[PDB]
Structure formats: structure tokens, C-alpha cells
Amino acid sequence: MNIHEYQAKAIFVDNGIPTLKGKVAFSVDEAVANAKELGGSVWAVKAQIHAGGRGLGGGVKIAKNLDEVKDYASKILGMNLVTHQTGPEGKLVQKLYIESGANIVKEYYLAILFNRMAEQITIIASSEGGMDIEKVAKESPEKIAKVGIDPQIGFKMFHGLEVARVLGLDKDEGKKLISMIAKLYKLYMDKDMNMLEINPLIKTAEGDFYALDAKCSFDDSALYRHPEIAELRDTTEENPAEREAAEFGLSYVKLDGDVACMVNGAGLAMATMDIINYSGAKPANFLDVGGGASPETVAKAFEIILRDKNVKVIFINIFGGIVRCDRIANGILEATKNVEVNIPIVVRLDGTNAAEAKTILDNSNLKNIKAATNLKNGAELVKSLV
Amino acid sequence: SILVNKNTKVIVQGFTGKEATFHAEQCMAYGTNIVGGITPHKGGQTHLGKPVFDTVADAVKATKADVSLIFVPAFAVGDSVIEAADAGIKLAVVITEHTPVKDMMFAKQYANKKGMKIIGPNCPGIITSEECKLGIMPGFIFKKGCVGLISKSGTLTYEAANQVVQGGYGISTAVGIGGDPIIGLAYKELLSEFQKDDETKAIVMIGEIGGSLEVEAAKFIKENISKPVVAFIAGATAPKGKRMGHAGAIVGSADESAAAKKEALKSYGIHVVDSPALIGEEIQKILGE
């Protein structure tokens, strides 16, 4: 799960991490009041959407007086913000962050993230703040420090000195940044994060370091023990159908294609999408449903799959191991009751009582249910119906 | 066979839970030597005719088991792996899905230091055909034969096993290595075991998108494994940057993609299968009719 810039920064403040003063605004009047309350003579007015690239998209404007705050907030709040990261449809802006303007002299890249191959944490830093870190790594590797942090020891001064070298920081500047990085590492660990990205991290003319932006991603498996992170969720930023499926115990991902699939187990579900492609059609979705799911759950899975009116065939591919295929077949028949659908359903059930299951489906005399037992035959039947 | 057999003594962590009870009973009926289990505050009881203990340490002292089968909920997995390692368990098979990655990261470092190997988490376990099973796999699919199986998935493993049995062969041992970003034993360690196992003549490896274990395995196979290897890598059609059910099944960069893995395996001489329907057929090509 991802959170907004303003939410990351409130976490930072709650953990003693230096941050520019700022506050979220849900209306134009709230934006103006926030600027008044913050003081100074410069305020950034920022669209709050999860997607990056808000500046180029026109979602960040720097106001020099309270009329500009009012004007900018009116233009940004309610806009459809298009960035490179939103894609062309853009995203409706429903909240602003109002932040005091800093006197920026340097911008850096800083991220903390999981290194899967080494089973440890990486701290990535670059002198090239604001830029695309993948392009900087490819083109100019000497402007990047990639520092491997063994979690047994955690982040140490010696790791920091490597970051400070690549950022060209002097002794005292280095010490101040390294102190901030130690707090960010501790937060990353404490909140079960899997990505903390600050692009850019600014150094002010007064010698302070702040995150000008912040993108935090949290391990979905650990949200149960961080209720203060879970409550930050913004469902307008998440896919409604994926979320709805997950409420019913289903994992669903929408693709563009003509053959829907319903499968038990993520590996077999991916393999099912793969065989549809190999057969010369296109998978319309990933869906993992338990073979033991209730007919109610199966009925919800049918509902979700059939929303896509480009689908020409449903391929049910279920391996009943511990769960008997004959009971899966009965549940599919129950789940199709009172449904009005003109597309064929290929049902490949294999494993325990596979033969009985096929007998049950054949005996229903519902001729647009087409039972198969072997995977190869299943996929060939799907292909003939497309 | 590798790692486990009909004599291996096994304790169950989370023994009295409902699911664990169901599977433990099926494992015992299949031939697994389950000698006991753990549930805090139920020490001294009896369950499925075996002793219950409060702690792994009490169970290991009474039974001398050095293999554990772990069914505890996701919030308990890390601490249960650490407990097993602390007590002298040598192999922990961890079924449960949705373990926080960080918990697994720390638990594995401790297991490594104590010399405990892990299978899983987020896996169906390990089975030695017609001898023993530790986990949730359907025993009867696994008919004894000369084909080893290593898989990051559950049901797709059964599909592969079934194709091999239908194609006139069978399985020596099948290991589900897990669908999480951090797992225990994987392709290199298990391929080495299978290479030393005289009953195994060929190995099927089943992978998926995410990380690069299957790329690294390719060179390793060329250099160390002379038994034939068949590979199927799920997720050729997966979109980039999207989790496909399993926490580990996400393409973050090009070398984590199914195409990158298949291409590496192919170039090092592995028998790579494009269609998941044709794994059994590949084994028939290799071994004969």
C-alpha cells in the first residue's frame, strides 16, 4: 500500500524527522488559511495524488502572496492532473498540500528499499535529485551510491559516509544528513516499509535537509500491526474491482483480452493466462479463487469476470487436490443459477474425482458449459470457441 | 527421494488448529511419522494420538524430532521459525501465506546461523511419493518414480506431477519452495540433492515471475547438474509491476520477467517448455516411452 506526500510527511513529523512546515487542504479556503497559519512569504501549492511527475503535469505552483495561494489552489484542486506516471487519463485532484517554500541550493535522490537477491536493505543516493534514477545509474554510475545494509547491524555511520561522499557533502553537512538517514532507516524498519523514496531531498541555503517529496510503500502483509498506517489508505488511488475481489477472498487483476479465466492458485492462474496466449488468444484477467470457495464466492467471481463485455469465453481451470472436483462442479452449477450469459464456459477440472465431476457437468445438459479433463484439450477447446 | 522419508520424525507447530489438524491427520494416514506437536498452553494433552507440548524445546527433548511442519498464522511465522531454530530443528517446512517479509528476513538469518534449513514460507510443503508428506498436497497424485520436482507454486505442482504420472513416470520427491520474496531452500540446493539421489533421473523446475533465482540457476545447472532438467516459468503474459497473487510474483525489472528466465535457462541447455500442458510430454521426450 502507498500513501500521499502529506501523509508521509506527518509520519516523518511524528518520528522526529526534519520536515518543511506544511498542511493538507481539502478546499480553497483551507489552503489560504493554511498559508496564513504557516507564515513566511512563499508557499508551494501541491496536488496530492500517488502518481509522480506532478510538477511537469502542472500540479505544483509556488505562491508568493495569499492571492496567488487562493488562485493556485482554485486551479489545482478539482483538476484532472495528467503526469507521465498517471498515463493519459490523469487523476482527479481531491486534496492539496500547502508547504513553506525553502531556499533550495541542492537536490539529491535518496531511497531505502528491499534488495530481494541479497535479502537485505539498499540505500540508494545520487547527486542528481529530480532526475530518473534508472537513467542516472545507466548513464553515470559514479553519481550514485548503492549501499547494502545488512539488517543484522542496520544503518551505521560508515554507510552514511559513503552516501555523503557521493553527494559531495562536507563534514558537518554529512553529519546532519546521516542523522536524518538513520531516522529514515529506523522508520522504514519500524513500519514494515518496502520502499521509501525521496526525490528530491533538498539542501537549503541555511544547511538543512528536507524531503521535498516522499513516496512510501508498505508491506500489505504487515498492515494488521500498523493500524495508524492502514487508516491512511486512499481507496480513490486503488483499483475498485481488485479491492472488491479481495473482500470476497479472490485475487483479481484486469488485463485486455477475450478469454476470462478462473483458476485455483496463483501459479496455475498465471500458467492458464500463459496457455491462452500460447493457443493464440488473449487472457482478459488473472483470477485466483480457492477450489474450496463457497458457491457464493464463485458467483461473485463470475460477476466480476463478466463485467468485461469484450470477454468471448470463460476458461475455468481448477485442480481439485484436497478438494473433490465433484463438489467443485456442483458449486459451479449452483453459482451459474439465474445467470443470463451467452458466452461459453470451458470447465477443466482435474485431480480428485475428476471423472465424476465431468459426468456431473455433462449430465446438467447446460450445453454452453463444456467440460474437459486434460489441460491441453481444455486450451484447444477455448481456442476453437474463439 | 531427498530430505524426508517414512522414518523422518516430524513435529507440527500449530498442531491443534483446525486446518493443521485436518492436514496432520492426512499426513499421518499417508505414512508420515508425526511424533507430536506444539500449541502453547496445551502441553501435556494428547492430539491425533500424539503428545502436545507448549514449546518446540520440550517437544525436541521428549521426541528427538529434527523436522518441523509449521501451520501457525502469519503473525506467528517468524517467531515460530526462530523457535524451531533455537531448539535444534534442522528442517522447518512452513506452509502459511502472508508472513511479513521483514519477519522472514530476520527469521532466515537466525535459521542460517543455527544451521536450520527452511522450506517455504507460502508453500504446500514436501512429499516423498508413497512414503511421507509434510504439508497440504494431495498424496494420491504423487505416484513413485524417478522425476524430482521443485516448484514455487501449489496447484501447478500437482498439475505437473499429474502430467508426469499420466505420461508413464512418477515423482521421487516434490518440494514446494514457496511464493514469497524471501524463501528458504531453492533450485540450487535442491538440484544438488537430486543430483546425488540415485532414484532421481530427471528434475522438473517450476518457477514464476519475480527476482532472478531461475536466471542464476541456469548457469549453476550447466556447471553442476548433469541430470536433465525441464523448466516451466509461469507469468509470460503477466503485466509489469503488478502482483499476480503471490507476494513474490511481481516483475520489477526485465531480468525478473518470465521471458528473461526462460531465455537464460534455454541458453544453458535446460529443457524449457512454453505451454504448461506439455511438462509431462517433455519428460517423455527425455526419458523415452
Ligand SMILES: [Cl-]
Ligand atoms: Cl500457487
